[PDB]
Design a protein around this ligand. Structure first.
Ligand SMILES: Nc1ncnc2c1ncn2[C@@H]1O[C@H](COP(=O)(O)OP(=O)(O)NP(=O)(O)O)[C@@H](O)[C@H]1O
Ligand SMILES: [Mg+2]
Lengths: 48, 51, 452, 587, 344, 389, 116
């Protein structure tokens, strides 16, 4: 489902920038998630 | 554990909502801008030929 | 013979001082160098005819060229002798064999079947592909497309059905008509080599149009094939399978012709009449009441940028009676053919299955395998997003079901023919994976007779 | 022949002339007193609409239009080879000499070939011999490398009444033939329209791999003779080198190089640098078997659009001789830009992104004219055209129309990557993105010719490179020291394939070209090393120990590329070393 | 004023380095005698100042031979034109220059004439007088605007995005009137300046210009709004002939290597900055924090030299090294150790 | 349609006082300059122009209502005599051609206004001309062009649209008028532009941006949250910015230029941050950056946001603008220094609630009481100095 | 007709008049039909160049006159095509009238009445 935006040349350029940002942010959020997870595993074993 | 869930939700909201919407809106606007350009040349050809 | 060409404006030519010229009439231009070019009348007014030339208008001198009006539209000379033969997009021999002696000439637009004279599609065509035959069955007279993409194996599948397809319990009154539209020499050679080597060509007619043939010839091609088909089916009483590829190429050529006339363009620059134009082809499929024979169609197309909302797949989907979908996900998995049964559907399937046709277990197994696979796939989707742990032991079973379904049922190889019996039986084996208590779409009587 | 009309309207690029009834559509014409190039697009009664491709400034009504009598054509004959032309075949060298000027002066008309020059024509056919299009009646040793065969031109069927060896110009009668229309005189040259494909007896599957000697291409993404390859050329990815390598090292007889509509200074390089390239076999200049087409961006749009067509037609003429030709086009994106401009100037209905609706067809027309064929003539001789095109996508985005439409009709794609270039990896072909749809066929061919499982080795090396990309994800997250002993071996092999095999310095004396045989031995030592080393892991030996033990031999592997072609034995012996060393480390 | 197409085999390869005095150009996007290197700007962006600076500072090194500067203003305001005229007078830059000053309220036909008048004059000075000429033209978007106006007068249907079909031929024709010719002493170097409407590099003007010219220097408002002067973004900027103008004998031996390194370290720095925002201060490696600080200093000290600061190539090179010195030797992977030991 | 002749055109170097904080600080227009306000409907183009007509220190105001609302004109004739700057109406000229009056008269009005403006310019006066809006004038040209069956430029407008606009603006500017006296006079052009759908790729906006030196781009998204004037601080610019900084430094005898650069630099960083933030941020942000977002928020709300209809906030003197911005930057500075000493964002914010309220309400302080603002600077330093210990 | 009736009632018979016209989108569709039939130069989407002007000749017939006791208050209604406020009808209408009250599908589905 597409967002409610007006099909202008500027809007296209905005969303394309917003998308390159989104992509990079997603990888970095995945990286953290994985780090916290292995740090979590060490501590959860201690807990257990 | 909570902070893991908090990060998961953000990753997921990006992977499954934000990125798709961006991607789908971008492709839509490209197409629309293209139809408009075609519409203009159609009208300009008709305009020219009022002559 | 007219020495009266008045104008040449890119593709279109204006001939004045004409008389008795009719819309859509076939013409011949005899150029100043003795070359011959055919063409068609687009517009006729007062004493003026607008024509379009197939091979184009380059090299033409107006003064010294002449136009002949042929008094008839574009036709094909049809014959039973066409079986085993290879033609170009205009029904001209390509195979260095004898000329054809025609029984008659038929206008390639064909004629519309009176909806009251139309006979609903009935009965089974065994493609020999399991995911088609069992879950998305092809019925005699149906139009069932393949939606593919770039680098997907639609040619391999096209070739497989062409050689494997048959009708059970009757021979030999089955023909295949193969139309290649705007394809490269190498694609065209693969098809032709295959038909010859497997012996398929003995029961086929081939109409081959290449990527560098003129555009008008390209849109002529499927019509030439459908005309030959109708002849074989209705006059000679055959069951005919018409496979056409690639219909995207068809559309582009239609779009090319449309833009050259500077017509008003539809969505994405395709003609406004793209829907109607495709319908004029696909509605030639069918059965007629009181006539032996049928015309069955499998149009194959590639979806641009994999997008099913594109005018080509979208309009084709609005005309045809189901669709078979090839996906990347499956292709990267080495599933041959990479058919995804979820987006796929045959709308007319029950007219071609059941006792007397396939087997009594057919519809029930289909509903069940489908449901299991859908549930299986949903479980895989869950494991990826949230990990193994989010699944019930039952989900895991279903997830494993989906995986064998993909790897063992759908994936058969492009050279393996499966009889409907072999297919159904294999369906039962994958069902055995599940608790009997799970098989809710199938009644006890069937479970008792078949469940391994 | 030449047809004169009168200009009745001048409006920018558009000119209209009356009294042109002897002219035809698509004919080229010289416009105005001055004589700048134009093409007849339209004809109404006797009024022609003409697109003018040079400045019409200062042209007015009442001035002539001279019609050439034909559509864009090339002169084909002795004097073609080693010349540099523009898109409409204007001879750049001759321009300088006759003109004594540094400019392609407008209105200046010069024949593409030297019509004054003497050629020794060696007759090889005998009087009374029946002939048709394609038969060789004699030859001329045109350059130090190439022999120019004189073929009976299309449209001629007859018997040879008179023929003699001797010295003629390309305009002299060299043969007499008895046609159905009485006697006809042949000369050493023929004209062909660049838009009409040169006819053949039959077209064949291109199933013989062209040896470029570039390891990455020949092994992983092969092209066959008569095949076609697309190469995106971002800036800084060593595209020119790669092209130079194919230009000199591929087993083709002739190279046609086309520059479509290039940046002035960028085009200056090709003109200087091509003649500097040396033929390996004769050590003569590569230009001795090259025809070169050069258009800068400010050349006539006609010239820039016709460029590839002009080049492919010349390629066909030599193809027809039974030669293997290679056509290299840089850049087809620019050629496409000429089409986009022409579509605008013709007030057309646009296709995608401003290009014409016939862009795909225009492209299909080009590529379908390359390929393996049987040429006309009694000989039934084979010849081929192999097409290598650069695309310069506006964003390095592959998704645009030109590239997508090319990829519809060609089977090879070599993705040059500047990020690889930045890591110092040449050729900078991205081995994950690239592909060859000739891969299966080439491997079948290669297994036959070598009698080895070459196709199994390739699949295996590619599986390892693909495994590497998955392993690199893990190396990022958990660090390199967290991978299993097995995964760490895979990283090493892949690394070997990358540094020992894929990387090839063009400028080294031995590394510049690798034979098929050497390629096989080189790849085999690497896979063998991986194989024997995997065995040893299976037997409780540790990764680090295998590495420390195999220093000397892994070095021998890394020199493989430098081992002289003459001394292949020294690469093959490495196999025995790997096994001797590994088993020893297992102790 | 139309000029003529140069026979390609008559062109000479650009040999000489040109010292614009702007580090962002001289080092990372070198301008070479006979190149066509445009500036892509936008409305409200200081290409005015940049153009004036380039025109004051442009020089060849160790040549005593002096640059004739041919300056064209196409449809610019009085205020912009007076700034350029006062600048040339103020600094004595006029003594080397020829100015063709077209105003926005001047007729469209004159506005189309301006670049051609100016290039004819340049070719005269270069190829008749033997001078080395630098041609600066702003604003090229104003010229395309006039082309449309005449195009409509003749009732011609636009090609892509509202512009004539023949725009490419028209722009190509202009820009290719630059370079060196074999056997002729002098040269013409072009720097066309254009504004990209709504900052759109996809726009026909910058897009078609980019195919014709040999690279482009890009100004961005992102940089401008943080006070970076000149606001040149190195990442999307490019010179296609830099190599021919750099290294031993022309600038210094370390030129290319440092350019490649600064380019990467700045890319890495910007990535490190992002990481800082997304994952937070703590997830940053100490090596990562340095790249962050590097990208900050690189924009603020190296790229931000000011519109009136003329840096020699040697100062630029030295400042780069100074900036690279923030990193560990272990990180400067794209420089031979040979050079690391010589320059720190 | 003829420009009245002059002896010499000059460079406009003196900043106009609009009294609108966002304009005077970040995108100032000088006397004899040309500015555009392109914006979608309801964004506040009209209200911006009323403010300048009311508060600017020109001698004379010519207000040309071109294709707009009748009521808007009756608002001015009725409200202006009741205002002071001596009545406001006594320095004012009004051309009114409303939206439903004849189309061709829209062009006539733009021309009669600038000509009347030039006439007073020659007398040696400073004249501000507001054209509201120039889109209707262009749209009147679009109507005639269509009726004549001319070949349109883009979006239907005649191809000479750009040249027409350039004639108008080139008529504006600071000059030496004809005569031995050699008088100086200025014409400052303030134009409204009304792009369809708020899309500024359109021809009228694009062509205007090429002949003006100030762009005050209004944002519908800022108007909806009632941030007025709804000027996009990222997108807007003033080519007079550098010259004006200098003039302001000299006048105030402070480093104004630097304050303004830091202001924009902070706003630009806010933008950079908000991009990444709107997808993951806040929770994980560094304290330095959290602080940055607060200074940007103070600028946006405490300084940028100004209500035309408030008795006090309708106008701000330079002395008052400087004091407000100092107080805002002093906060960011002092807070910045505290973070570097080891203090925490949360500590600082919780400890500065009262002082931050004062900063927020300083827009409301009367011109007679500026000490009540400049005294916040001492409270900032004391409060934060205290929190570190 | 309606505004002539209203202006008469207010300024000639001294009443306070409320004018409600719906739906204005249909009005503009008619103008296009004529515009197209006349084969005038089209604007955006086929709408005529004079759409703004035509609309203003309706919407500016509202308000109050000095010394006359009546008034005309206009509440025009339009449906925005595709819910798109940038469409020429709502765009131009919005540039003419004195504000606008917007209803949204989101608020409506949430049970908010009126869904302003
Ligand atoms: N600076 C401001 N202070 C307070 N309120 C404002 C301000 N600017 C705009 N508004 C509010 O927004 C409304 C619209 O402003 P207005 O100037 O009429 O918009 P506009 O952009 O001129 N619309 P249009 O004339 O249709 O293009 C005004 O009535 C005010 O209610
Ligand atoms: Mg307003």
């Amino acid at each position: 489902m597409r967002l409610n935006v007006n099909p202008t040349r500027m809007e296209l350029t905005r969303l394309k920038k917003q998308l390159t940002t989104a992509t990079r942010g997603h990888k970095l959020l995945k990286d953290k998630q994985d780090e916290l997870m292995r740090q979590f595993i060490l501590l959860i074993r201690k807990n257990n | 554990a909570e902070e893991i869930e908090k990060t998961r939700r953000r990753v997921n909201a990006l992977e499954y909502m934000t990125i798709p919407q961006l991607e789908e809106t971008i492709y839509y606007i490209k197409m629309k801008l293209e139809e408009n350009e075609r519409a203009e040349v159609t009208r300009l050809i008709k305009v020219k030929n009022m002559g | 013979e007219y020495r009266t060409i008045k104008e040449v404006v890119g593709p279109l030519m204006a001939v004045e001082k004409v008389s008795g010229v009719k819309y859509e009439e076939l013409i011949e231009v005899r150029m100043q160098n003795g070359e011959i070019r055919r063409g068609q009348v687009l517009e006729v007014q007062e004493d003026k005819a607008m024509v379009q030339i197939f091979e184009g208008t380059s090299g033409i001198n107006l003064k010294n060229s002449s136009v002949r009006f042929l008094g008839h539209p574009l036709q094909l000379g049809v014959s039973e002798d066409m079986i085993g033969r290879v033609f170009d997009g205009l029904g001209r021999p390509k195979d260095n064999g004898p000329e054809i002696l025609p029984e008659k000439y038929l206008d390639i637009n064909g004629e519309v079947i009176n909806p009251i004279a139309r006979d609903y599609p009935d009965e089974f065509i065994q493609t020999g592909i399991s995911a088609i035959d069992h879950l998305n069955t092809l019925v005699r007279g149906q139009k069932l497309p393949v939606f593919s993409g770039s680098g997907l194996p639609h040619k391999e599948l096209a070739a497989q059905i062409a050689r494997q397809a048959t009708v059970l319990d009757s021979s030999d009154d089955f023909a295949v008509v193969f139309a290649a539209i705007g394809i490269t020499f190498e694609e065209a050679e693969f098809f032709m080599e295959d038909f010859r080597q497997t012996g398929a060509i003995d029961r086929s007619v081939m109409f081959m149009n290449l990527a560098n043939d003129p555009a008008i010839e390209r849109i002529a091609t499927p019509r030439m094939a459908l005309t030959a088909a109708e002849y074989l089916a209705y006059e000679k009483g055959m069951h005919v399978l018409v496979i056409m590829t690639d219909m995207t190429n068809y559309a582009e050529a239609l779009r090319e012709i449309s833009a050259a006339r500077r017509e008003v363009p539809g969505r994405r620059g395709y003609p406004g009449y793209l829907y109607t134009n495709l319908a004029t082809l696909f509605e030639r499929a069918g059965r007629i009441r009181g006539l032996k024979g049928s015309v069955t169609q499998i149009p194959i197309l590639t979806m641009p940028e994999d997008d099913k909302t594109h005018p080509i797949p979208d309009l084709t989907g609005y005309i045809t009676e189901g669709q078979i979908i090839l996906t990347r996900e499956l292709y990267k998995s080495g599933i041959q053919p990479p058919i995804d049964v979820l987006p796929s559907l045959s709308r007319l399937k029950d007219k071609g299955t059941g006792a007397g046709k396939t087997r009594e277990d057919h519809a029930a197994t289909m509903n069940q395998l489908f449901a299991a696979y859908a549930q299986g796939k949903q479980a895989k989707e869950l494991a990826v997003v949230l990990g193994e742990s989010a699944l019930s032991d039952i989900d895991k079973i279903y997830a494993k079901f989906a995986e064998r379904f993909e790897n063992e049922y759908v994936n058969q190889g492009f050279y393996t023919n499966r009889t409907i019996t072999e297919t159904l039986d294999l369906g039962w084996e994958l069902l055995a994976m599940l608790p009997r208590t799970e098989l809710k779409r199938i009644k006890d009587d069937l479970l008792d007779k078949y469940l391994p | 022949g030449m047809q004169i009309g009168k200009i009745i309207k001048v409006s920018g690029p558009l000119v209209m002339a009356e009294n042109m009834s002897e002219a035809s559509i698509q004919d080229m014409c010289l416009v105005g007193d001055l004589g700048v190039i134009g093409e007849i697009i339209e004809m109404r009664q006797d009024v022609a609409s003409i697109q003018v491709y040079e400045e019409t400034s200062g042209i007015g009504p009442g001035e002539p239009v001279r019609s050439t009598g034909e559509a864009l054509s090339v002169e084909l004959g002795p004097g073609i080879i080693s010349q540099m032309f523009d898109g409409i075949q204007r001879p750049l060298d001759t321009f300088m000499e006759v003109t004594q000027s540094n400019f392609l002066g407008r209105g200046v008309q010069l024949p593409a070939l030297d019509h004054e020059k003497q050629w020794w024509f060696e007759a090889t056919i005998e009087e009374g011999t029946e002939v048709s299009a394609g038969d060789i009646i004699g030859y001329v040793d045109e350059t130090k490398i190439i022999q120019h065969k004189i073929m009976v031109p299309n449209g001629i069927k007859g018997t040879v009444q008179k023929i003699e060896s001797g010295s003629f110009t390309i305009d002299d009668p060299i043969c007499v033939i008895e046609t159905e229309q009485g006697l006809k005189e042949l000369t050493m040259m023929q004209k062909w329209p660049v838009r009409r494909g040169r006819p053949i007896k039959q077209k064949l599957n291109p199933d013989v791999p062209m040896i470029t000697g570039q390891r990455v291409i020949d092994t992983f993404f092969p092209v066959t003779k008569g095949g076609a390859a697309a190469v995106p050329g971002p800036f800084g990815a060593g595209k020119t080198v790669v092209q130079h390598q194919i230009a000199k090292w591929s087993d083709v007889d002739l190279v046609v190089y086309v520059g479509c509509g290039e940046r002035g200074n960028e085009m200056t390089d090709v003109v200087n640098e091509f003649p500097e390239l040396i033929d390996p076999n004769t050590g003569e200049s590569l230009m001795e078997r090259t025809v070169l087409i050069a258009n800068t961006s400010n050349m006539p749009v006609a010239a820039r659009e016709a460029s590839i067509y002009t080049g492919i037609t010349i390629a066909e003429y030599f193809r027809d001789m039974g030669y293997d030709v290679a056509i290299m086009a840089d850049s087809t994106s620019r050629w496409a830009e000429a089409l986009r401009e022409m579509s605008g100037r013709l007030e057309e209905m646009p296709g995608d992104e401003g290009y014409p609706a016939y862009l795909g067809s225009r492209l299909a027309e080009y590529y379908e004219r390359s390929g393996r064929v049987i040429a006309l003539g009694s000989d039934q001789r084979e010849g081929s055209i192999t097409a290598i095109s650069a695309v310069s996508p506006s964003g390095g985005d592959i998704s645009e129309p030109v590239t997508q439409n090319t990829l519809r009709v060609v089977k090879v794609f070599w993705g040059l990557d500047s990020s690889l270039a930045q890591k110092r990896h040449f050729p900078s072909i991205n081995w994950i993105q690239s592909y060859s749809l000739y891969s299966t066929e080439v491997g079948r061919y290669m297994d036959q010719i070598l009698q080895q499982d070459w196709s199994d080795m390739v699949t295996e090396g590619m599986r390892i490179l693909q495994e590497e990309e998955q392993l690199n994800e893990i190396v990022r997250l958990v660090g390199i020291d967290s991978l299993s002993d097995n995964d760490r071996l895979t990283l090493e092999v892949a690394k070997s394939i990358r540094e020992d095999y894929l990387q090839q310095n063009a400028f080294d004396d031995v590394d510049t070209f690798t034979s098929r045989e050497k390629q096989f031995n080189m790849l085999k030592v690497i896979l063998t090393f991986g194989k024997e080393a995997r065995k040893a892991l299976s037997l409780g030996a540790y990764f680090n120990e295998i590495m420390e033990g195999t220093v000397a031999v892994r070095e021998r592997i890394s020199r493989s590329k430098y081992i002289p072609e003459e001394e292949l034995a020294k690469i093959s012996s490495i196999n025995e070393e790997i096994k001797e060393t590994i088993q020893l480390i297992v102790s």
